[PDB]
Fold this protein.
Amino acid sequence: VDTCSLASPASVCRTKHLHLRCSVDFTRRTLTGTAALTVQSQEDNLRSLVLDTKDLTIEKVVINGQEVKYALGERQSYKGSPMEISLPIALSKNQEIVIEISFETSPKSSALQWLTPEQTSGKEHPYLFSQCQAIHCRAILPCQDTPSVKLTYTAEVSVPKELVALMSAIRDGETPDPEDPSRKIYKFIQKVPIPCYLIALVVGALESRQIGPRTLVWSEKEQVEKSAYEFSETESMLKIAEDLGGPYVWGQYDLLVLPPSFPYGGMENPCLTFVTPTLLAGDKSLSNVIAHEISHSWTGNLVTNKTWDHFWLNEGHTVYLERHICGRLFGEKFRHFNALGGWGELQNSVKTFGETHPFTKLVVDLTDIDPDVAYSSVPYEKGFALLFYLEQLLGGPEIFLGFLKAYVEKFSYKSITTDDWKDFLYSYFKDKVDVLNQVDWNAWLYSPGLPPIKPNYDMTLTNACIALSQRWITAKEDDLNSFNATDLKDLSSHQLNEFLAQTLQRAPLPLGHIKRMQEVYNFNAINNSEIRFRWLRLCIQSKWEDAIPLALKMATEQGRMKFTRPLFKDLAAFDKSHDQAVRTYQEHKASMHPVTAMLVGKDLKVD
Ligand SMILES: N[C@H](CC(=O)O)Cn1nnc(-c2ccc(Oc3ccc(Cl)cc3)cc2)n1
Ligand SMILES: [Yb+3]
Ligand SMILES: [Yb+3]
Ligand SMILES: [Yb+3]
Ligand SMILES: [Zn+2]
């Protein structure tokens, strides 16, 4: 049962297709139009159906050219309001009908961020972007808002003529709007069935540059050149991913670099991956995010979790595939380094939630839980650790990659549960069932805390990070003069980041140690967002007042939640910055992404 949805389940009726015709009104901050759903009954004598909606204004519902009766139920907090539609004629099993809903979104839609010209790079045009994952598609249009249902889609999007619309689909032309010459209509087609959380829309002053045979990079003019260089390894990663997962079925693999308020590192929107501009390090060092989004074209987009309780299936396998891509490009020692780093992030999440917390379980129960509030590294890293443990138990990466490719082939275009995955794992590894029966399944899948077994990790690249972190932690005042810029000479950006993550795990350090670290390593000069974030957290947690304006500027000049949420929490925990953190959130709240504003508010205990 999908406990996050109020719609009729897949066992009652299934949406097969969506034909969306809408107009983006920047003056009213509304998306207005019609959502024509092709629905197939799964039952005899079907007379009504229920859809998910959230803050939607419904004008009318048309079936067979006539208006029908519908009713909106009472709002159920973050789930929204159920929409019951009375069918004009009873449907037989497998019968399909088209339901056309005339609707309008709220300016406060939790799926959307409306940006004024001043919040963009160009300063002349506004911008709009969506983020449906997990359950925000219902805040854009009426739908069965559940990943247990897969549908194809077509769309016609009217926008001011000076702007460009893009979707999670193949571009199908553009024409001037026949109703308004100041507007253009952009057309789109998504021929592969997808869960509704993969529907995405961006409208802005966008330009593109080709970077591969099947890839364009899109952004505002100011970011095009830097993005083309930053993401130049994309095609090489797509080739490795095809070798590991089988055919890439989506046609195009484009990238869109969003404005800084984009709330996540990326979004695996089919045909058009969305990315944070915080990846623009200048040296391609944050390209594992591209490898992760590319991987989702198999794990997540083809093989989807049936409900949000099984989200680890999506993430665990994606991180697993991501780490193999980076291991093929940079070596097996690099794959072990990234995997060991992941275990450390899992340790941090478990410590933050508490070792008995229900969100530290691999398979969760989201009944009455806002999925955005449950979001953490647990499904990613505890899911990756399980797969990495099984890889070692079952004979190594070559054998386990055979399972991964067979798993994708088996479940492509389907929505599955942990039991479907486990059953297939046992089926594929039938000759190793005795080995599989030694796994503590109940602990791995259903128990909170760190997993029952830690995998084996090559330490080659991690050793220097640990050694330097330990020198700093054990140093007394009279040892501070021994540190010098030469300590960092043989460290890659990845190793510098790991040195900071290891040190941050033992924070606070004495204030004098942090001041010396800035004196000798000049970490304040580093623009790499991952490094800068860990360094600023280390300064704030070590009570360095000089770091306060730096941490506030980072928390506000970008909005990636991975960075913004811990920076505001650390700034609120430091007595010297507490009031500034609260005031800064208060002044920026109206202008923040709606999900980010809600979560930062909860973290700060500011209503
Ligand atoms: N998919 C993007 C690209 C990438 O992951 O690389 C990143 N992303 N964007 N949005 C979301 C997202 C995911 C899940 C959510 O609900 C939960 C949380 C935890 C659980 Cl156990 C179940 C359900 C809510 C939001 N994730
Ligand atoms: Yb066409
Ligand atoms: Yb079985
Ligand atoms: Yb000493
Ligand atoms: Zn992911």
